[PDB]
């Protein structure tokens, strides 16, 4: 395994509390990635990770003028443009729900408005993946509709293993019990 060697490899020459800092977050977003790759592997959908608004809105819309707009630039985990509908569609790996809704008022503020003005039918879907209990909860209706079942095989305890081992290299620091 590629990535958890070179995870393996900087959490042994580690040696300050920043840089170990950097560490535990490229982990937790490689396991977010992961959770996108087998999520949209599942679907057979395909797989993007941060798209730029504009862009999602250029390849639904060719004929639109950004400019007549004003597109907050997000980017969004991925989208499903059904012809009909648009579906934004962004991962989440976590046991709570406080990252969800966090993003569910982002995107549901910032992306609906735009998308009426121009006239896309568009939803905003959020898919979490809890990595303790791999168990999906979604947020989004017509998401649910066109995915009832999601046949995914995860297995997040690569990723727990290697925090675990950086948390234990720094639980006698305290500044990095502060940083984390
Ligand atoms: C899970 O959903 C998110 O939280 C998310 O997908 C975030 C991202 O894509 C970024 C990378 C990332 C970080 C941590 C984890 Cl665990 C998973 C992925 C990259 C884009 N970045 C947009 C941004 C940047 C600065 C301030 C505000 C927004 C956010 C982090
Ligand atoms: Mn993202
Ligand atoms: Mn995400």
């Not at 998308?115 to 990595?131: D, F, K, L, S, V």
């Not at 046949?151 to 675990?164: D, G, H, Q, S, Y």
Request: net charge negative; aromatic share 10%; proline share 4%.
């Amino acid at each position: 395994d590629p990535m958890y060697e070179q995870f393996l490899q900087r959490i042994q020459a580690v040696r300050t509390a920043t840089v170990a800092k950097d560490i535990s977050a490229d982990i937790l977003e490689a396991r977010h990635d992961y959770f996108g790759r087998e999520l949209c592997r599942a679907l057979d959908i395909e797989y993007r990770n941060n798209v730029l608004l504009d862009e999602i809105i250029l390849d639904v819309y060719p004929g639109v003028n950004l400019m007549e707009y004003n597109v907050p630039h997000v980017t969004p985990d991925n989208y499903i443009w059904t012809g009909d509908m648009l579906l934004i569609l962004d991962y989440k790996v976590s046991v709570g729900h406080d990252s969800t809704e966090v993003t569910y008022k982002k995107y549901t503020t910032l992306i609906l408005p735009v998308m009426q003005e121009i006239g896309i039918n568009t939803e905003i879907c959020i898919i979490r993946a809890n990595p303790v209990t791999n168990q999906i909860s979604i947020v989004g209706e017509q998401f649910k509709r066109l995915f009832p079942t999601i046949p995914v095989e995860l297995n997040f305890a690569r990723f727990f293993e290697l925090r675990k081992m950086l948390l234990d290299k720094f639980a006698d620091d305290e500044e990095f019990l502060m940083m984390i």
